[PDB]
Assembly symmetry: C4
Homo-oligomer: 140 residues x 4
Protein backbone atom coordinates (compact mmCIF):
# COMPACT_ATOMS: atom_id res chain seq x y z
CA UNK A 1 0.00 0.00 0.00
CA UNK A 2 1.01 3.66 0.26
CA UNK A 3 3.49 5.14 2.69
CA UNK A 4 5.48 8.27 3.35
CA UNK A 5 9.21 8.64 3.76
CA UNK A 6 9.59 9.82 7.34
CA UNK A 7 12.41 12.10 8.40
CA UNK A 8 15.27 10.83 10.50
CA UNK A 9 15.78 13.90 12.70
CA UNK A 10 18.86 14.97 14.60
CA UNK A 11 17.44 14.05 17.99
CA UNK A 12 18.43 10.45 17.13
CA UNK A 13 22.04 11.54 17.61
CA UNK A 14 23.04 11.74 21.25
CA UNK A 15 26.42 13.18 22.25
CA UNK A 16 28.40 10.77 24.39
CA UNK A 17 27.26 7.49 22.76
CA UNK A 18 29.04 5.55 20.03
CA UNK A 19 27.80 6.31 16.52
CA UNK A 20 26.95 4.63 13.23
CA UNK A 21 28.53 6.62 10.40
CA UNK A 22 26.79 6.49 7.02
CA UNK A 23 29.65 6.57 4.52
CA UNK A 24 28.87 7.25 0.86
CA UNK A 25 31.16 7.15 -2.20
CA UNK A 26 29.92 8.57 -5.47
CA UNK A 27 31.33 8.32 -8.95
CA UNK A 28 34.81 6.96 -8.29
CA UNK A 29 36.03 4.20 -6.01
CA UNK A 30 38.17 4.41 -2.88
CA UNK A 31 37.72 8.11 -2.02
CA UNK A 32 38.41 8.40 -5.74
CA UNK A 33 36.21 11.46 -5.85
CA UNK A 34 33.08 12.90 -4.16
CA UNK A 35 31.94 11.35 -0.90
CA UNK A 36 29.89 11.92 2.22
CA UNK A 37 30.28 10.85 5.85
CA UNK A 38 27.11 11.31 7.86
CA UNK A 39 26.50 10.73 11.57
CA UNK A 40 23.50 8.44 11.15
CA UNK A 41 22.53 7.03 14.57
CA UNK A 42 23.64 6.97 18.22
CA UNK A 43 23.87 3.40 19.45
CA UNK A 44 24.36 1.44 22.67
CA UNK A 45 25.95 -1.59 21.01
CA UNK A 46 27.97 -1.53 17.75
CA UNK A 47 26.33 -2.88 14.59
CA UNK A 48 27.63 -6.22 13.31
CA UNK A 49 25.50 -7.87 10.62
CA UNK A 50 25.64 -11.64 9.82
CA UNK A 51 28.68 -13.21 8.14
CA UNK A 52 27.17 -13.84 4.69
CA UNK A 53 24.66 -11.00 4.28
CA UNK A 54 25.69 -7.67 2.75
CA UNK A 55 24.41 -4.27 3.92
CA UNK A 56 23.10 -3.81 0.39
CA UNK A 57 20.63 -6.60 1.05
CA UNK A 58 18.78 -4.74 3.78
CA UNK A 59 19.64 -1.17 2.90
CA UNK A 60 18.80 0.86 -0.21
CA UNK A 61 19.51 4.58 -0.63
CA UNK A 62 18.71 7.31 -3.16
CA UNK A 63 20.33 10.76 -3.20
CA UNK A 64 17.83 13.31 -4.63
CA UNK A 65 17.83 17.12 -5.15
CA UNK A 66 15.29 19.07 -3.13
CA UNK A 67 15.95 22.51 -4.48
CA UNK A 68 18.59 24.45 -6.38
CA UNK A 69 21.11 23.76 -3.61
CA UNK A 70 19.75 21.32 -1.00
CA UNK A 71 19.65 17.52 -1.28
CA UNK A 72 17.90 14.67 0.59
CA UNK A 73 18.92 11.03 0.95
CA UNK A 74 16.03 8.54 0.84
CA UNK A 75 16.14 5.22 2.69
CA UNK A 76 14.38 1.88 2.43
CA UNK A 77 15.17 -0.31 5.39
CA UNK A 78 14.46 -4.05 5.52
CA UNK A 79 12.76 -5.55 8.57
CA UNK A 80 15.88 -7.33 9.71
CA UNK A 81 17.87 -4.09 9.74
CA UNK A 82 14.97 -2.02 11.04
CA UNK A 83 14.69 -4.42 13.99
CA UNK A 84 18.46 -4.46 14.48
CA UNK A 85 18.89 -0.67 14.51
CA UNK A 86 15.89 -0.09 16.74
CA UNK A 87 17.37 -2.37 19.42
CA UNK A 88 20.81 -0.73 19.28
CA UNK A 89 19.42 2.80 19.16
CA UNK A 90 19.99 5.14 22.09
CA UNK A 91 16.87 7.12 21.14
CA UNK A 92 13.61 5.11 21.39
CA UNK A 93 13.03 3.12 18.15
CA UNK A 94 13.11 6.04 15.69
CA UNK A 95 13.72 3.94 12.61
CA UNK A 96 11.02 3.05 10.09
CA UNK A 97 10.90 1.28 6.71
CA UNK A 98 10.88 4.42 4.54
CA UNK A 99 12.96 7.38 5.59
CA UNK A 100 15.04 10.31 4.48
CA UNK A 101 17.33 12.86 6.09
CA UNK A 102 18.11 16.42 4.91
CA UNK A 103 21.64 17.38 3.93
CA UNK A 104 22.96 20.88 4.56
CA UNK A 105 24.29 23.30 1.94
CA UNK A 106 27.84 22.04 2.53
CA UNK A 107 27.00 18.31 2.28
CA UNK A 108 24.67 18.84 -0.67
CA UNK A 109 27.28 20.35 -2.98
CA UNK A 110 29.19 17.07 -2.98
CA UNK A 111 26.07 15.11 -3.88
CA UNK A 112 25.18 17.66 -6.57
CA UNK A 113 28.67 17.66 -8.10
CA UNK A 114 28.42 13.91 -8.61
CA UNK A 115 24.97 14.11 -10.18
CA UNK A 116 23.70 11.93 -7.30
CA UNK A 117 25.37 8.76 -8.56
CA UNK A 118 26.06 6.40 -5.68
CA UNK A 119 28.85 3.88 -6.19
CA UNK A 120 29.03 2.37 -2.68
CA UNK A 121 27.81 3.01 0.86
CA UNK A 122 28.24 1.53 4.32
CA UNK A 123 27.55 2.01 8.02
CA UNK A 124 30.68 2.22 10.18
CA UNK A 125 30.90 1.97 13.97
CA UNK A 126 32.50 5.00 15.54
CA UNK A 127 33.72 4.69 19.11
CA UNK A 128 33.30 7.19 21.93
CA UNK A 129 35.62 10.02 22.98
CA UNK A 130 37.59 10.53 26.25
CA UNK A 131 34.68 12.37 27.93
CA UNK A 132 32.00 10.24 26.30
CA UNK A 133 30.56 8.51 29.40
CA UNK A 134 30.87 11.67 31.47
CA UNK A 135 29.11 13.68 28.75
CA UNK A 136 25.94 11.56 28.49
CA UNK A 137 25.50 11.14 32.24
CA UNK A 138 26.23 14.78 33.04
CA UNK A 139 22.92 15.90 31.59
CA UNK A 140 21.27 19.01 33.12
Amino acid sequence: SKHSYVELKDKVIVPGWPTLMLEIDFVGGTSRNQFLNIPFLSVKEPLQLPREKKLTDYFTIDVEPAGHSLVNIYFQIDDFLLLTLNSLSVYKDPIRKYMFLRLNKEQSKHAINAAFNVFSYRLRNIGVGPLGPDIRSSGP
Copy 2:
Protein backbone atom coordinates in the same frame (compact mmCIF):
# COMPACT_ATOMS: atom_id res chain seq x y z
CA SER B 1 8.44 47.22 -22.76
CA LYS B 2 9.45 46.78 -19.12
CA HIS B 3 9.61 43.52 -17.21
CA SER B 4 10.94 42.03 -14.02
CA TYR B 5 13.24 39.07 -13.58
CA VAL B 6 11.09 36.55 -11.75
CA GLU B 7 12.58 34.07 -9.31
CA LEU B 8 12.85 30.41 -10.17
CA LYS B 9 12.05 28.95 -6.75
CA ASP B 10 12.94 25.56 -5.34
CA LYS B 11 9.41 24.21 -5.59
CA VAL B 12 10.20 23.60 -9.29
CA ILE B 13 12.47 20.78 -8.14
CA VAL B 14 10.57 17.63 -7.26
CA PRO B 15 12.37 14.68 -5.66
CA GLY B 16 11.84 11.49 -7.63
CA TRP B 17 11.78 12.99 -11.15
CA PRO B 18 14.68 13.28 -13.58
CA THR B 19 16.45 16.64 -13.50
CA LEU B 20 18.00 19.26 -15.77
CA MET B 21 21.39 20.25 -14.36
CA LEU B 22 22.60 23.77 -15.12
CA GLU B 23 26.36 23.37 -15.52
CA ILE B 24 28.55 26.48 -15.54
CA ASP B 25 32.29 26.85 -16.23
CA PHE B 26 33.98 30.13 -15.45
CA VAL B 27 37.41 31.40 -16.35
CA GLY B 28 39.12 28.24 -17.57
CA GLY B 29 37.93 25.47 -19.85
CA THR B 30 37.18 21.83 -19.06
CA SER B 31 36.77 22.06 -15.26
CA ARG B 32 39.96 24.08 -15.69
CA ASN B 33 38.96 26.16 -12.69
CA GLN B 34 35.81 27.50 -10.95
CA PHE B 35 32.48 25.94 -11.86
CA LEU B 36 28.92 25.42 -10.70
CA ASN B 37 26.44 22.57 -11.07
CA ILE B 38 22.90 23.59 -10.23
CA PRO B 39 19.74 21.47 -10.10
CA PHE B 40 17.67 23.65 -12.41
CA LEU B 41 14.36 21.89 -13.15
CA SER B 42 12.49 18.62 -12.52
CA VAL B 43 11.27 17.17 -15.79
CA LYS B 44 9.02 14.41 -17.10
CA GLU B 45 10.87 13.97 -20.41
CA PRO B 46 14.59 14.69 -20.96
CA LEU B 47 15.55 17.83 -22.89
CA GLN B 48 16.89 17.32 -26.41
CA LEU B 49 17.13 20.46 -28.53
CA PRO B 50 17.28 20.42 -32.38
CA ARG B 51 20.34 19.12 -34.25
CA GLU B 52 21.69 22.46 -35.52
CA LYS B 53 20.66 24.93 -32.81
CA LYS B 54 22.93 25.63 -29.83
CA LEU B 55 21.69 26.22 -26.27
CA THR B 56 23.39 29.60 -26.47
CA ASP B 57 20.84 30.60 -29.09
CA TYR B 58 17.89 30.36 -26.74
CA PHE B 59 19.61 30.78 -23.40
CA THR B 60 21.54 33.74 -22.00
CA ILE B 61 22.86 33.98 -18.42
CA ASP B 62 24.50 36.60 -16.22
CA VAL B 63 26.12 35.89 -12.85
CA GLU B 64 25.79 39.00 -10.61
CA PRO B 65 26.70 39.84 -6.97
CA ALA B 66 23.79 40.59 -4.66
CA GLY B 67 25.69 41.45 -1.54
CA HIS B 68 29.13 41.04 0.00
CA SER B 69 28.76 37.26 -0.16
CA LEU B 70 25.62 36.19 -2.06
CA VAL B 71 25.23 35.96 -5.85
CA ASN B 72 22.29 35.62 -8.28
CA ILE B 73 22.21 34.17 -11.79
CA TYR B 74 19.98 36.04 -14.25
CA PHE B 75 18.26 34.30 -17.16
CA GLN B 76 16.78 35.33 -20.48
CA ILE B 77 14.88 32.48 -22.08
CA ASP B 78 13.79 32.44 -25.72
CA ASP B 79 10.22 31.45 -26.61
CA PHE B 80 11.29 28.17 -28.16
CA LEU B 81 13.08 27.11 -24.97
CA LEU B 82 10.46 28.63 -22.69
CA LEU B 83 7.82 26.54 -24.48
CA THR B 84 10.03 23.46 -24.44
CA LEU B 85 10.84 23.60 -20.71
CA ASN B 86 7.27 24.37 -19.71
CA SER B 87 6.04 21.21 -21.44
CA LEU B 88 8.72 18.99 -19.87
CA SER B 89 8.35 20.54 -16.42
CA VAL B 90 6.96 18.46 -13.57
CA TYR B 91 5.80 21.63 -11.80
CA LYS B 92 3.11 23.58 -13.72
CA ASP B 93 4.76 25.93 -16.28
CA PRO B 94 6.99 27.89 -13.88
CA ILE B 95 9.31 29.24 -16.54
CA ARG B 96 9.15 32.80 -17.88
CA LYS B 97 11.25 34.92 -20.25
CA TYR B 98 13.24 36.79 -17.58
CA MET B 99 14.31 34.95 -14.48
CA PHE B 100 16.94 34.54 -11.82
CA LEU B 101 17.71 32.12 -9.02
CA ARG B 102 19.58 32.80 -5.75
CA LEU B 103 22.83 31.00 -5.00
CA ASN B 104 23.76 30.06 -1.45
CA LYS B 105 26.89 31.15 0.43
CA GLU B 106 28.71 28.00 -0.71
CA GLN B 107 27.80 28.31 -4.41
CA SER B 108 28.39 32.05 -4.45
CA LYS B 109 32.05 31.89 -3.41
CA HIS B 110 32.89 30.08 -6.63
CA ALA B 111 31.13 32.71 -8.72
CA ILE B 112 32.81 35.49 -6.72
CA ASN B 113 36.29 33.97 -7.01
CA ALA B 114 35.97 34.01 -10.79
CA ALA B 115 34.76 37.61 -10.89
CA PHE B 116 31.52 36.33 -12.49
CA ASN B 117 33.13 35.55 -15.83
CA VAL B 118 31.20 32.81 -17.61
CA PHE B 119 33.12 30.79 -20.18
CA SER B 120 30.51 28.11 -21.01
CA TYR B 121 27.23 26.71 -19.70
CA ARG B 122 24.84 23.89 -20.51
CA LEU B 123 21.78 21.97 -19.33
CA ARG B 124 22.40 18.27 -18.72
CA ASN B 125 19.79 15.54 -18.25
CA ILE B 126 20.19 13.69 -14.98
CA GLY B 127 18.41 10.37 -14.61
CA VAL B 128 16.46 9.10 -11.63
CA GLY B 129 17.68 7.07 -8.65
CA PRO B 130 16.76 3.50 -7.53
CA LEU B 131 13.82 4.73 -5.40
CA GLY B 132 12.86 7.51 -7.79
CA PRO B 133 9.42 6.26 -8.91
CA ASP B 134 8.58 5.05 -5.41
CA ILE B 135 9.61 8.42 -3.95
CA ARG B 136 7.34 10.64 -6.07
CA SER B 137 4.28 8.39 -5.77
CA SER B 138 4.72 7.79 -2.05
CA GLY B 139 3.66 11.32 -1.21
CA PRO B 140 1.87 11.89 2.14
Copy 3:
Protein backbone atom coordinates in the same frame (compact mmCIF):
# COMPACT_ATOMS: atom_id res chain seq x y z
CA SER C 1 37.12 62.36 19.28
CA LYS C 2 35.14 59.12 19.53
CA HIS C 3 33.43 57.31 16.69
CA SER C 4 31.83 54.00 15.83
CA TYR C 5 32.69 51.65 13.00
CA VAL C 6 29.55 51.67 10.88
CA GLU C 7 28.47 48.63 8.90
CA LEU C 8 28.76 48.54 5.14
CA LYS C 9 25.55 46.65 4.36
CA ASP C 10 24.68 44.61 1.30
CA LYS C 11 22.26 47.19 -0.07
CA VAL C 12 25.37 49.02 -1.37
CA ILE C 13 25.70 46.23 -3.92
CA VAL C 14 23.33 46.62 -6.85
CA PRO C 15 23.00 43.86 -9.44
CA GLY C 16 23.60 45.16 -12.95
CA TRP C 17 26.29 47.76 -12.14
CA PRO C 18 30.05 47.31 -12.32
CA THR C 19 31.68 46.38 -9.02
CA LEU C 20 34.73 47.11 -6.88
CA MET C 21 36.17 43.82 -5.64
CA LEU C 22 38.04 43.89 -2.34
CA GLU C 23 40.84 41.36 -2.81
CA ILE C 24 42.78 40.18 0.24
CA ASP C 25 45.88 37.95 0.46
CA PHE C 26 46.93 36.61 3.82
CA VAL C 27 50.10 34.87 4.89
CA GLY C 28 51.70 34.04 1.55
CA GLY C 29 52.14 36.08 -1.60
CA THR C 30 50.55 35.63 -5.02
CA SER C 31 47.58 33.41 -4.08
CA ARG C 32 50.34 31.63 -2.17
CA ASN C 33 47.80 30.62 0.43
CA GLN C 34 44.59 31.92 2.08
CA PHE C 35 42.75 34.76 0.39
CA LEU C 36 39.41 36.52 0.11
CA ASN C 37 37.58 38.22 -2.76
CA ILE C 38 34.71 40.37 -1.58
CA PRO C 39 32.16 42.32 -3.63
CA PHE C 40 32.71 45.66 -1.93
CA LEU C 41 30.73 48.35 -3.79
CA SER C 42 28.55 48.87 -6.88
CA VAL C 43 29.85 51.78 -8.92
CA LYS C 44 28.87 53.95 -11.87
CA GLU C 45 32.45 54.75 -12.94
CA PRO C 46 35.49 52.50 -12.34
CA LEU C 47 37.96 53.49 -9.62
CA GLN C 48 41.33 54.81 -10.80
CA LEU C 49 43.46 56.46 -8.11
CA PRO C 50 46.31 58.93 -8.88
CA ARG C 51 49.56 57.78 -10.52
CA GLU C 52 51.86 58.08 -7.48
CA LYS C 53 49.56 57.32 -4.54
CA LYS C 54 49.07 53.76 -3.30
CA LEU C 55 45.75 52.35 -2.04
CA THR C 56 47.54 51.67 1.23
CA ASP C 57 47.81 55.42 1.73
CA TYR C 58 44.07 55.97 1.94
CA PHE C 59 42.91 52.53 2.99
CA THR C 60 43.64 50.55 6.16
CA ILE C 61 42.01 47.22 7.06
CA ASP C 62 41.92 44.88 10.05
CA VAL C 63 40.51 41.34 9.99
CA GLU C 64 39.11 40.48 13.46
CA PRO C 65 37.24 37.48 14.98
CA ALA C 66 33.70 38.16 16.16
CA GLY C 67 32.88 34.78 17.59
CA HIS C 68 34.07 31.19 17.47
CA SER C 69 33.40 31.08 13.73
CA LEU C 70 32.47 34.51 12.33
CA VAL C 71 34.89 37.31 11.39
CA ASN C 72 34.58 41.05 10.60
CA ILE C 73 36.84 43.27 8.51
CA TYR C 74 37.34 46.79 9.88
CA PHE C 75 38.01 49.78 7.63
CA GLN C 76 39.52 53.22 8.01
CA ILE C 77 38.98 55.31 4.92
CA ASP C 78 40.84 58.54 4.19
CA ASP C 79 38.90 61.62 3.05
CA PHE C 80 40.28 61.46 -0.46
CA LEU C 81 39.07 57.88 -0.90
CA LEU C 82 35.85 58.46 1.03
CA LEU C 83 35.04 61.32 -1.36
CA THR C 84 36.09 59.29 -4.38
CA LEU C 85 33.99 56.21 -3.53
CA ASN C 86 30.94 58.24 -2.58
CA SER C 87 30.90 59.91 -6.01
CA LEU C 88 31.30 56.61 -7.90
CA SER C 89 28.79 54.76 -5.72
CA VAL C 90 25.50 53.60 -7.22
CA TYR C 91 23.88 53.67 -3.77
CA LYS C 92 23.70 57.17 -2.21
CA ASP C 93 26.99 57.98 -0.40
CA PRO C 94 27.06 54.99 1.98
CA ILE C 95 30.75 55.25 2.80
CA ARG C 96 32.09 56.72 6.04
CA LYS C 97 35.53 57.05 7.67
CA TYR C 98 35.23 54.05 10.01
CA MET C 99 33.48 50.95 8.78
CA PHE C 100 33.31 47.19 8.88
CA LEU C 101 31.49 44.44 7.03
CA ARG C 102 30.51 40.97 8.31
CA LEU C 103 31.95 37.86 6.68
CA ASN C 104 29.90 34.67 6.43
CA LYS C 105 30.85 31.27 7.85
CA GLU C 106 32.47 30.30 4.53
CA GLN C 107 34.54 33.49 4.14
CA SER C 108 35.50 33.56 7.81
CA LYS C 109 37.23 30.17 7.83
CA HIS C 110 39.86 31.48 5.45
CA ALA C 111 40.52 34.51 7.63
CA ILE C 112 40.62 32.29 10.74
CA ASN C 113 43.00 29.75 9.18
CA ALA C 114 45.49 32.53 8.51
CA ALA C 115 45.24 33.94 12.02
CA PHE C 116 43.99 37.21 10.47
CA ASN C 117 47.39 38.18 9.07
CA VAL C 118 46.95 40.43 6.05
CA PHE C 119 49.83 40.50 3.57
CA SER C 120 48.27 42.61 0.80
CA TYR C 121 44.90 43.96 -0.33
CA ARG C 122 43.44 45.88 -3.24
CA LEU C 123 40.25 47.09 -4.90
CA ARG C 124 39.71 45.75 -8.42
CA ASN C 125 37.21 46.99 -11.01
CA ILE C 126 34.88 44.27 -12.20
CA GLY C 127 32.94 44.90 -15.39
CA VAL C 128 29.28 44.16 -16.06
CA GLY C 129 27.70 41.01 -17.50
CA PRO C 130 25.77 40.48 -20.79
CA LEU C 131 22.41 41.35 -19.16
CA GLY C 132 23.86 44.01 -16.89
CA PRO C 133 22.13 47.12 -18.32
CA ASP C 134 18.88 45.23 -18.84
CA ILE C 135 19.01 43.93 -15.26
CA ARG C 136 19.29 47.30 -13.48
CA SER C 137 16.67 49.03 -15.62
CA SER C 138 14.22 46.14 -15.51
CA GLY C 139 13.39 46.81 -11.88
CA PRO C 140 9.85 45.94 -10.68
Copy 4:
Protein backbone atom coordinates in the same frame (compact mmCIF):
# COMPACT_ATOMS: atom_id res chain seq x y z
CA SER D 1 28.69 15.14 42.04
CA LYS D 2 26.70 16.00 38.91
CA HIS D 3 27.31 18.92 36.60
CA SER D 4 26.38 20.24 33.19
CA TYR D 5 28.66 21.22 30.35
CA VAL D 6 28.04 24.94 29.97
CA GLU D 7 28.30 26.67 26.61
CA LEU D 8 31.18 28.96 25.81
CA LYS D 9 29.28 31.59 23.81
CA ASP D 10 30.60 34.03 21.24
CA LYS D 11 30.29 37.04 23.51
CA VAL D 12 33.60 35.87 25.06
CA ILE D 13 35.27 36.99 21.83
CA VAL D 14 35.80 40.73 21.67
CA PRO D 15 37.05 42.36 18.47
CA GLY D 16 40.16 44.44 19.07
CA TRP D 17 41.78 42.26 21.78
CA PRO D 18 44.41 39.58 21.29
CA THR D 19 43.02 36.05 21.00
CA LEU D 20 43.67 32.48 22.11
CA MET D 21 43.31 30.18 19.11
CA LEU D 22 42.23 26.61 19.80
CA GLU D 23 44.12 24.56 17.23
CA ILE D 24 43.10 20.94 16.64
CA ASP D 25 44.74 18.25 14.48
CA PHE D 26 42.87 15.05 13.80
CA VAL D 27 44.02 11.79 12.29
CA GLY D 28 47.39 12.76 10.84
CA GLY D 29 50.23 14.81 12.25
CA THR D 30 51.54 18.21 11.16
CA SER D 31 48.52 19.47 9.17
CA ARG D 32 48.79 15.94 7.77
CA ASN D 33 45.05 15.93 7.28
CA GLN D 34 41.86 17.33 8.88
CA PHE D 35 42.21 20.17 11.35
CA LEU D 36 40.38 23.02 13.03
CA ASN D 37 41.43 26.50 14.16
CA ILE D 38 38.92 28.09 16.50
CA PRO D 39 38.92 31.57 18.03
CA PHE D 40 38.54 30.45 21.64
CA LEU D 41 38.91 33.49 23.92
CA SER D 42 39.70 37.22 23.86
CA VAL D 43 42.46 38.01 26.32
CA LYS D 44 44.21 40.99 27.90
CA GLU D 45 47.53 39.19 28.48
CA PRO D 46 48.86 36.28 26.37
CA LEU D 47 48.74 32.78 27.85
CA GLN D 48 52.07 31.27 28.92
CA LEU D 49 51.83 28.13 31.04
CA PRO D 50 54.67 26.87 33.32
CA ARG D 51 57.90 25.45 31.87
CA GLU D 52 57.34 21.77 32.73
CA LYS D 53 53.55 21.39 32.55
CA LYS D 54 51.83 20.45 29.29
CA LEU D 55 48.47 21.86 28.15
CA THR D 56 47.24 18.27 28.10
CA ASP D 57 47.59 18.21 31.88
CA TYR D 58 44.97 20.87 32.47
CA PHE D 59 42.95 20.58 29.28
CA THR D 60 40.90 17.67 27.94
CA ILE D 61 38.66 17.83 24.85
CA ASP D 62 36.13 15.59 23.12
CA VAL D 63 34.72 16.21 19.64
CA GLU D 64 31.15 14.79 19.45
CA PRO D 65 28.37 14.76 16.79
CA ALA D 66 25.20 16.64 17.69
CA GLY D 67 23.14 15.84 14.65
CA HIS D 68 23.53 14.59 11.09
CA SER D 69 25.75 17.58 10.28
CA LEU D 70 26.60 19.64 13.38
CA VAL D 71 29.31 18.86 15.95
CA ASN D 72 30.19 20.10 19.47
CA ILE D 73 33.55 20.13 21.25
CA TYR D 74 33.39 19.29 24.97
CA PHE D 75 35.89 20.70 27.47
CA GLN D 76 37.12 19.77 30.92
CA ILE D 77 39.26 22.51 32.39
CA ASP D 78 41.51 22.06 35.43
CA ASP D 79 41.43 24.63 38.24
CA PHE D 80 44.87 25.96 37.41
CA LEU D 81 43.86 26.68 33.81
CA LEU D 82 40.36 27.81 34.75
CA LEU D 83 41.92 30.36 37.11
CA THR D 84 44.52 31.37 34.54
CA LEU D 85 42.04 31.94 31.69
CA ASN D 86 39.56 33.79 33.87
CA SER D 87 42.23 36.33 34.85
CA LEU D 88 43.39 36.89 31.25
CA SER D 89 39.86 37.03 29.86
CA VAL D 90 38.53 40.28 28.44
CA TYR D 91 34.96 39.16 29.17
CA LYS D 92 34.20 38.69 32.90
CA ASP D 93 35.26 35.18 34.04
CA PRO D 94 33.19 33.15 31.55
CA ILE D 95 35.15 29.94 31.95
CA ARG D 96 33.96 26.97 34.00
CA LYS D 97 35.18 23.41 34.63
CA TYR D 98 32.88 21.68 32.13
CA MET D 99 32.13 23.38 28.85
CA PHE D 100 31.41 22.96 25.18
CA LEU D 101 31.12 25.18 22.14
CA ARG D 102 29.05 24.59 18.97
CA LEU D 103 30.76 24.24 15.61
CA ASN D 104 29.10 25.50 12.43
CA LYS D 105 28.25 23.42 9.36
CA GLU D 106 31.59 24.33 7.77
CA GLN D 107 33.74 23.50 10.82
CA SER D 108 31.77 20.34 11.59
CA LYS D 109 32.46 18.63 8.26
CA HIS D 110 36.15 18.47 9.09
CA ALA D 111 35.46 16.91 12.47
CA ILE D 112 32.99 14.47 10.89
CA ASN D 113 35.38 13.45 8.10
CA ALA D 114 37.95 12.43 10.69
CA ALA D 115 35.46 10.44 12.74
CA PHE D 116 36.17 12.81 15.66
CA ASN D 117 39.63 11.40 16.34
CA VAL D 118 41.81 14.02 17.98
CA PHE D 119 45.57 13.59 17.57
CA SER D 120 46.79 16.87 19.12
CA TYR D 121 45.48 20.26 20.24
CA ARG D 122 46.84 23.52 21.58
CA LEU D 123 46.02 27.12 22.46
CA ARG D 124 47.99 29.70 20.48
CA ASN D 125 48.31 33.42 21.21
CA ILE D 126 47.19 35.58 18.32
CA GLY D 127 48.24 39.22 18.33
CA VAL D 128 46.13 42.24 17.49
CA GLY D 129 45.63 43.96 14.13
CA PRO D 130 46.60 47.51 12.99
CA LEU D 131 43.26 48.99 14.16
CA GLY D 132 42.99 46.74 17.20
CA PRO D 133 43.28 49.36 19.98
CA ASP D 134 41.17 51.84 18.04
CA ILE D 135 38.51 49.18 17.44
CA ARG D 136 37.89 48.21 21.08
CA SER D 137 37.88 51.79 22.39
CA SER D 138 35.73 53.14 19.58
CA GLY D 139 32.65 51.39 20.92
CA PRO D 140 29.25 53.06 20.31
